[PDB]
Symmetry: D2
Subunit: 230 residues, 4 copies
């Protein structure tokens, strides 16, 4: 069984896949025919991922991954390699506290990315896609700027191996967090005048994972209905 202009037979790793945007990315990739490995930081979350994938007919697995630790990352990859193959699509979705958070997130992004690159180097093919945070404002803006820069820098480091690195900057998305006066205030700031759906973020990620986006790298695609806050 051999494939053409699809994600068929590709193994995709999606962190933070148990709810909201991560779950939708997991499902969209599966719908495009990838083998999807979703991760959570707990056993119960990893089980819910496996059951969700199964209910949507997606071949894959739920796994426990803690992106903040080198041992958890190394072990998880060797497990995946042994059972399923090398993951060549990797989606990193997992006031005055802004510095630590952003730094921590970037260490995890780096750590995971560096681990999965040996595989992708070997294949001369890969996709790394980073999901930024949903829309206090100081943290949002710092996060976004660190994510853009990180994505642009890593893209440069791994371009020559035919690995794209890209990011998706979501705006105001309908997730369990965001679900009145404050709600109407936000809708006034969004040109389309509506919240985004999780699936709308997934669609962009799906496209970036495809062969049609092979010349796109280092980019951050904002998916925010026209609300730009930097």
């Amino acid at each position: 069984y051999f494939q053409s202009m699809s994600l068929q037979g590709k193994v995709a790793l999606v962190t933070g896949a148990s709810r909201g945007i991560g779950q939708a990315i997991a499902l969209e990739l599966g719908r495009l025919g990838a083998v999807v490995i979703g991760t959570a930081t707990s056993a119960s979350g990893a089980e819910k991922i496996a059951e969700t994938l199964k209910a949507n007919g997606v071949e894959g697995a739920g796994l426990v991954l803690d992106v903040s630790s080198d041992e958890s990352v190394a072990a998880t990859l060797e497990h995946i390699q042994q059972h399923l193959g090398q993951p060549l699509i990797v989606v990193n979705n997992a006031d005055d506290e802004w510095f630590d958070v952003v730094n921590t997130n970037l260490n995890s992004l780096y750590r995971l990315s560096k681990a999965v690159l040996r595989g992708m180097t070997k294949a001369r093919w890969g996709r790394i896609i980073n999901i930024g945070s949903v829309v206090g404002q100081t943290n949002y803006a710092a996060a976004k700027a660190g994510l853009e820069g990180f994505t642009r820098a890593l893209a440069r480091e791994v371009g020559s191996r035919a690995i794209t690195v890209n990011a998706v900057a979501p705006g105001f998305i309908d997730t369990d967090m965001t679900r009145e006066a404050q709600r109407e205030a936000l809708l006034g700031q969004i040109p389309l005048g509506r919240l985004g759906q999780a699936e709308e973020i997934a669609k962009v990620v799906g496209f970036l994972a495809s062969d049609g986006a092979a010349y796109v790298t280092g980019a951050t695609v904002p998916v925010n209905g026209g609300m730009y806050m930097s």
Copy 2:
């Protein structure tokens, strides 16, 4: 992904990136109207569409004139329907040229908006210039900045009607323009591109295809760079 039963207008469709956008949209099932500034170009567009099985038309359009624009839309409306996907593809040229081009973008966009307002649906996608000295670069950078800003502003003006407005900033693409830059200048550019290769016209078309889709309904005001990792400010 499906654009079935949608009418799409692509300006500058006779070669290179425009042609590929015309064919990709057709491949996704849109009725494609391609335009050129001459009758012979417009006829080549019709023959190219036919050879790829794409229903559509070749038409003569001069984006710089109100009469040409108004007439062309009426002709399209009469024969095919409202276009709801529209792809816009001597001193101090960094000012005059650029500002003239933004008037064309604006002129065309304003003309096709009545149709999209009526439908409560639309896609406007602007294609910026390909990379291709000293006189060169000031113009290139002014064009790119004007396109981003224009796109962001218009997206705001027409958001509430469920019309997205976006732009694609290509990098170094393999087209007839760029094949005939001197080899030294070509090799210089390859050194600056992380993927270490020229982009294909089809790679631009794919992005446009996605932006035209329902999957990109929450993307507006954006400029998607498609440049293999080469970024220029």
Copy 3:
């Protein structure tokens, strides 16, 4: 020190323009301020005099080639070549385009003089924060790009071109916004206060100086930390 330099400031009869006029005068330039009416031009002259600034009030309409050309030759004749020019002048599409034509028109006119001198300063003042967002953001992007492009075109002649992007400044426009809307804006500004006109003038003053000779094509935001793209 801007001593022995002639500086042209458009829109100098109130608010930010007036303050730029006074600051430049305070640094020792001869200041020519402009307004679109004779009574405004007279008020400029009386203001300059009350602050001990040598200069003039003048009627200028930046939107017309005849008004621009005539005004420069009148200045050249009486005072010398203006080598510091502050453009504080001038549905979103037409407006922004019009403003950029005025910028261009005036800049091109005063470049001959600066080329001759092998020295010059052009400083563009963008709009203050008051559909509302759309015009502001388009204006700002057109100003940055324009400034960046012209800086490239006139760099080799030792002319700098820069821009100042003000945030929420205390001027006659913003004095008339309802207190609830005012307090809302103050929440979005880190320094938690409106800016003064003089604070804009201080930046322009520095940009006009010799100390800023290596700064060109820049846009300096003066917005107390409130940033919008």
Copy 4:
């Protein structure tokens, strides 16, 4: 008797890291010229002593001190020493550095920890005064080379914008200066062909002087720049490189 001085930073204490040569030294001398008491720092005793002798030769009141921005103990001790002998530093220029595979990540993130560390330490003093100036100097201008340069610049801009938001309400401004191609002892010794190559990229068609960076810093330290915060002022003669 006793000479009062009429200058724009008179009676302010200014800390400048990495002050023993190049841009740091020039910032130290410019701030002194504007009348501040200047404390310059180096990572060694012999560097700190050269700073003192330089300040003295230019008639600047101040001190050379040993500081290692990468360590909390060195930072804390140095501030208390300064507060004890000279007063609270209310102008702080971060011009000390970092480096000692992926340097575009590790180096950059380490430097931003130093910036944050130092900035947090000097904020108590500035909070107390209801006044302060923090100014960060970015790096002066291969393929890997350019990756580092662009990451550094983007991190510095974002950092500066974020900290400005955190400390605005206390009347502390936080700003950055992004230098371009500045003239230094390394660049004076490049062959003319390599020199001319660089000058082609720069509209003003000339290298910048260290003093030209210092002038911008001097202005940002002033009361005239009280409404400017969160900004990065590029001082690159028009060469805009990302």
